[PDB]
């Protein structure tokens, strides 16, 4: 969405890039201002800039290098144990960037890996959302799993938890 | 025979108990199995209400019936979660009268008891067996054993020729659980006349392990039993439930133990326009005046924010406060209150302390002959506040043993082979007297203070409390104290100790403000002016200032600003907090230095 | 007994009007006598102080037998009575007397002319707490009421102890008088209900007993926030559970007539707006003339 | 085609549920809503007439309660429609601007809805042009641009998953399956898959594929 | 870089949305971030100046085609990003304003004057809608279905003998009514009554 | 905006109760309205109400029946599926068929909750037994739903005989997870 805040934030992450031309007066992209940017320079640009620079330019202006969030180590960790993995630390907008990357390069290995990860994680997500506390007189696991959730998973969990909580409140309303 | 009937009775309680329109225990079980917590907490008032006969059995012979209520829970859990799982733990809650720790004697052996105490030590987890696979040495016959951890079990003595004790355990096919040992000391007030506090050994299983830390008051439900280690047995308590006022799990890991309903209360309180006034008034309601010291104590309890720079340097985020003054000022009472409000705190007297008593000490185990490390006051207070009273009576060496733990927040040891760097992130609140007992204005400030500049510079704020005889103030204090002696607002002007402690925990684990550029420019200009003021004062007097102003004071002002911002859950610290921080610094440390 | 099923067997005897009247628990000899009674009944002190639910069940079952032989010796025989107990499945059973006590406690402490109006508004507010406590869907309110009732009875016991130890009761020929001026918990007695609770406590102890002539009592209390008294005449009561021809006859409360007569005759400034005509409000400086005229009236 | 008040209420409820669960903005049932509003006014007048004049107590209570129920249903329906118009304002403006498009707002919206659309669009455009757009160059000064990096016009989620109940006809598309039960056949072009929709069953389907069945009333969203 | 301010503004917008979701009943829009918006618009102004300078240099300068294309593309993208962040923040605030306007039948210092005008004329629009053919329905009514015909209610704050359309109610503080929900639904909404 | 965020894309439990309360139910009138004023409704049929006779089975809307029961002027006749024996049979059917849901009505939970709350003296079986049976059935169906959630995919999914309240509970999780799966798959091509 254009007005979706989460998407605007996601489009602001930095991705590695490598310029392929000689463009004077583009230093501000690099740390230093007002200096020519020589070819083969490596620098991290925001997605909203890097993507359009990569598709526009024959040789485009930049080439996208493999991000560290889609490296072989991360894929192996995803495949080994999806539920235990801490996605929030890898990137807070992992799934959105993954979908954007798949669309940009149309690679299906990543698509299958991400789909399996999402399904397996969603199983435990629903397990936790369905668990509602009770007060006898009138925890740790839930918190540790919540800490690991990505932003989109955190929205889905909130919605499902509220739905379950509303149904339980209606059914047992004295 | 009777065991099956008992199991059937406890299964019908879990399947038929409704107080209104919700099955409390059936739903608690399903919700626990869904998050992988194989246990059920049952309130004994509910069991006395379903069938009093079931309670009579559970209380008459606890170590025989509790094992039969666990299997009932397991059967119901299988029926509820599996469409045709270890043995479930039973955690008990009770409201029976608490027996004093020292009143437990032969009359309570093998009975359910409730008691309170202070945890002084915790052991490294051990592994107990729950399902052994065994084999015979000679004929190689395979069998299994099942064990419940309720003692009144050993390998078979005769095989099923094979000599005595023919069975060896097959470990790769057995299953084990967790076991922990705890030492419980009685509360200081409960102790009888002229008696040292007494200890008691306790053991917990599975989901009751790693629930407490040394130095926290707890309430225990368990079984007072005995184990043979002549015709005497050493008593111990088999824990069946732990209740504490400290969310140790939240403090060690993330933010936890706060319900959304509880969390909502904290946000509402933070939104109060005058939370600063309420917190200041809530500290020591029974001590008159001393508003600046109470604000300083609020800032010390709140703490600053710690930063780890990319190069690795760490910046202290705690605030240290010194109270120098004349007798009768209520410094010791303020320290005793701060020890009681803070989630973690230790009250120690500088006279009755030592370098090893603080920090950590090296001890030899009499059995293994191996040296190990035991934490002292500053380790026992890690993540909290240490109240060092009588700071002037401490010996020079024992005081010198505190510099690194006060500044770098680490305790480097190199003794008896043991070589390590522990962690001690504590705030020091110290009370002291001048050399002559009273701050004598006639003599120079270098004569009333025996503390060296190195130790003094480590304190963020130094308060030189002077007792001046003013008739109006004297009458006011007399009236206040008489009212205290002969004589509950709780109307938005003061909050109880429990709520304040929980709010401190929430703020510490939820906020860590950062300075905005305007605050940075303001604090930077103020530091330049203060340093110039010390130089003009020094040029005037040949003597070198006894109260120093180094970069540590700039960092202290930053910490005070950040604590004031954190008090209101504000992610950014603005000038409205910088002004208050500068005012407090001028009221304490520049005030002390000016004299 | 005071809240037998929600407190210990010890506290029920300790905080009971009748038991305190017949044993004088406000002094040390009374505590010694109560401990002797418990020792004779065969109930360990530790067992008695245990809460009702978790008390040893043998003694709980035998209580009727143990009480009936033992109580007559100590003069506490009339404790035996028949009442109404209501149980909701799988919940604790509560008696009518304890329910009424909880409701009254919620009414009392549930929570110039401007302050008076504010106080009356607060009591009108408490009315709805007590009204809610009557619904089985609201049980937390009832438990809250029982807790408050225990607190209030403890406070009344302490105030009565302070009154009796100092001998603040003046025994005039027409009536008894007791005026509180510097008590520790004097904010409690602005409510007529709490004042009547204390009045009943006093009426039973050392007034119902002692073989003294029946004399009406006047109880007054002060509040610095408004500098006025809340006087409250109280009717005397015959020895409890003593059926007799004279006890059969009822005793009326004449304080309304005398109070109105004196107010009309003197420039009293008395407020007689309370529904119970025996309770009025007086200014700090008018109580002495009012009581002098009361003694001289002779219509009490 | 009017049948009876009961049928009109049934269609009102069908429309309410479909609008609540659908991802797009369904066409407005002009005739049904006209009939319903007129009946509401007439019934209110009848209730007032009767009340102006003890066995008659219960009937009045029932009539008033039924009026409250009907008013609530219409209120929720209209509120949901207004919210959807808010979300898809630029999309509907785009529909109207295009002349090749078959749909026209006078058929897709009522008079109140079209008035709300125009007025709210004008108000919001005024606000944003004052606050932001008046500073940007002439190129980035359009609130509806589709040739930039990101499309500014939000379209309905065509492939959203929605629970459906197959209730059959009140038929050429109908057929039978191996087990002999009546069923419908639909194709998901993305996956090239053909999915059977047997009658009396509940499915979680994409909206695009079952959209025509929903329009013809063969299925109803739950 | 060139979108840091926009990112910060969107972060503040996210915080506002999270606060709105967490809050149960009372919601107050945070103070309009005038300073950050001023900085963002200033940045857009410098970007426009840069574009003008680039065009002038291309008209008379040694600049080449590829270099001009790249710079003219990087400036346009930066302006687009700033515009998107600004519009997202403003749209979130406007959505919350719409919700508030509908919650009422039809402090303010936080809003900027443009938002104040928007809210005023949006309430005018809501009332105009309510006046039309949907008069018999209370468009700004309750969205919870009617369940009970008669309810017990309690007066929460003292007020005179308010004369509502349905009748006269003597709103004495701490007094209960047995009335029909339909009549007293507005009073409950405002806070003069409670259901209990 | 016009519609709160918690009512978007889904119904609230009160909305489901509102929908359920329009289905017909059987009642035993305690009054004789039939003539040998008059109801005038517009949302349902009014002939049944105008023709009532004491102790004669008749069918009316559920909310009218509840309103009448509130006045002790009618006794609701509980559905046939809400007897002990029928619930035992349904429990057995659930137990023997791990891969399918029983053929309970699409409003069994909501109607059970409403009738237990309102008409406690109109059942021919002890209420506690019926509550226990409904709880057991709910647990079995919950196990089945948990097992069946492992087959979410970018294509259709089928949950036959699942009731309205359960579908309302599960609508957000199912719909959002399947939408994300579809988005990933579509991005793949
Ligand atoms: N407002 C008050 N100010 C000062 N003392 C108070 C106040 N209220 C109570 N006290 C009394 O202060 C006494 C405690 O001593 P205090 O803490 O004041 O000593 P200190 O000045 O810190 O110590 P030292 O006299 O050894 O230097 C207690 O008896 C307490 O009754
Ligand atoms: Mg001291
Ligand atoms: Zn052998």
Curated annotation (Swiss-Prot), chain B:
Residues at which ATP binds: 325-332
Main EC class the enzyme belongs to: hydrolase
InterPro entries, per the entry: MCM, MCM5, MCM5_C, MCM_CS, MCM_dom, MCM_lid, MCM_N, MCM_OB
EC nos: 3.6.4.12
Catalytic reactions of this protein: ATP + H2O = ADP + phosphate + H(+)
GO molecular function, one term: ATP hydrolysis activity
Localisation per UniProt entry: Nucleus
Motif (Arginine finger): 457-460
GO biological process annotation, one example: transcription elongation by RNA polymerase II
SMART domains cross-referenced by the UniProt entry: MCM
Stretches of the chain forming a coiled coil according to its record: none
Xref: Pfam families: MCM (PF00493), MCM5_C (PF21933), MCM_lid (PF17855), MCM_N (PF14551), MCM_OB (PF17207)
Superkingdom of origin: Eukaryota
UniProt miscellaneous comment: Present with 10300 molecules/cell in log phase SD medium.
Complex formation: Component of the MCM2-7 complex. The complex forms a toroidal hexameric ring with the proposed subunit order MCM2-MCM6-MCM4-MCM7-MCM3-MCM5; loaded onto DNA, forms a head-head double hexamer. Interacts with CSM1.
Family, as annotated: Belongs to the MCM family.
PANTHER family the UniProt entry points to: DNA REPLICATION LICENSING FACTOR MCM FAMILY MEMBER, DNA REPLICATION LICENSING FACTOR MCM5
Role: Acts as a component of the MCM2-7 complex (MCM complex) which is the putative replicative helicase essential for 'once per cell cycle' DNA replication initiation and elongation in eukaryotic cells. The active ATPase sites in the MCM2-7 ring are formed through the interaction surfaces of two neighboring subunits such that a critical structure of a conserved arginine finger motif is provided in trans relative to the ATP-binding site of the Walker A box of the adjacent subunit.
Name this protein carries in UniProt: Minichromosome maintenance protein 5
Recorded name of the encoding gene: MCM5
Swiss-Prot record, chain C:
GO aspect biological process, one term: DNA replication initiation
Localisation: Nucleus
Main location: nucleus
GO CC entries: CMG complex; DNA replication preinitiation complex; nuclear replication fork; nucleus
Keyword Phosphoprotein: yes
A GO molecular-function annotation: single-stranded DNA binding
UniProt KW Cell cycle keyword: yes
Keywords: Cell cycle, DNA replication, Nucleus, Phosphoprotein
Bilayer-crossing regions: none
Subunit structure, as described in the record: Assembles into a complex with MCM5/CDC46. Interacts with MCM10.
Function: Required for initiation of chromosomal DNA replication. Acts at the origin of replication. Also has a role in minichromosome maintenance.
UniProt record similarity statement: Belongs to the CDC45 family.
Additional detail: Present with 1730 molecules/cell in log phase SD medium.
Protein name, UniProt field: Cell division control protein 45
Taxonomic lineage from the root: Eukaryota, Fungi, Dikarya, Ascomycota, Saccharomycotina
Gene: CDC45
Portion of the full sequence shown: 326 to 650 of 650
From Swiss-Prot, chain D:
Keyword ATP-binding: no
GO cellular component annotations of the record: CMG complex; DNA replication preinitiation complex; GINS complex; nuclear replication fork; nucleus
Chief location bin: nucleus
GO BP terms in the entry: DNA-templated DNA replication; double-strand break repair via break-induced replication
Compartments where located: Nucleus
Record's keyword terms, sorted: DNA replication, Nucleus
Function statement: Required for DNA replication. Functions as part of the GINS complex which plays an essential role in the initiation of DNA replication by binding to DNA replication origins and facilitating the assembly of the DNA replication machinery.
Assembly: Component of the GINS complex which is a heterotetramer composed of SLD5, PSF1, PSF2 and PSF3. Interacts with PSF2.
Family designation: Belongs to the GINS4/SLD5 family.
Protein name: DNA replication complex GINS protein SLD5
Species this chain originates from: Saccharomyces cerevisiae (strain ATCC 204508 / S288c) (Baker's yeast)
Lineage, highest ranks first: Eukaryota, Fungi, Dikarya, Ascomycota, Saccharomycotina
Gene: SLD5
Residue range from the parent sequence: 52 to 294 of 294
Swiss-Prot record, chain E:
Keyword vocabulary terms for this entry: Cell cycle, DNA replication, Nucleus
A GO-annotated cellular component: CMG complex
GO biological process: DNA strand elongation involved in mitotic DNA replication; DNA-templated DNA replication; double-strand break repair via break-induced replication
Primary location group: nucleus
Listed SUPFAM superfamilies: GINS helical bundle-like
Record-linked CDD domains: GINS_A_psf1 (cd11710), GINS_B_Psf1 (cd21696)
Short name of one Pfam family: PSF1_C
Localisation: Nucleus
UniProt-listed InterPro entries: GINS_A, GINS_bundle-like_dom_sf, GINS_Psf1, PSF1_C
Keyword hit for Ligase: no
Function text: Required for DNA replication. Functions as part of the GINS complex which plays an essential role in the initiation of DNA replication by binding to DNA replication origins and facilitating the assembly of the DNA replication machinery. Required for the chromatin binding of CDC45.
Note: Present with 1431 molecules/cell in log phase SD medium.
Family (UniProt): Belongs to the GINS1/PSF1 family.
Subunit structure: Component of the GINS complex which is a heterotetramer of SLD5, PSF1, PSF2 and PSF3. Interacts with PSF2.
Name of the protein in question: DNA replication complex GINS protein PSF1
Protein source organism: Saccharomyces cerevisiae (strain ATCC 204508 / S288c) (Baker's yeast)
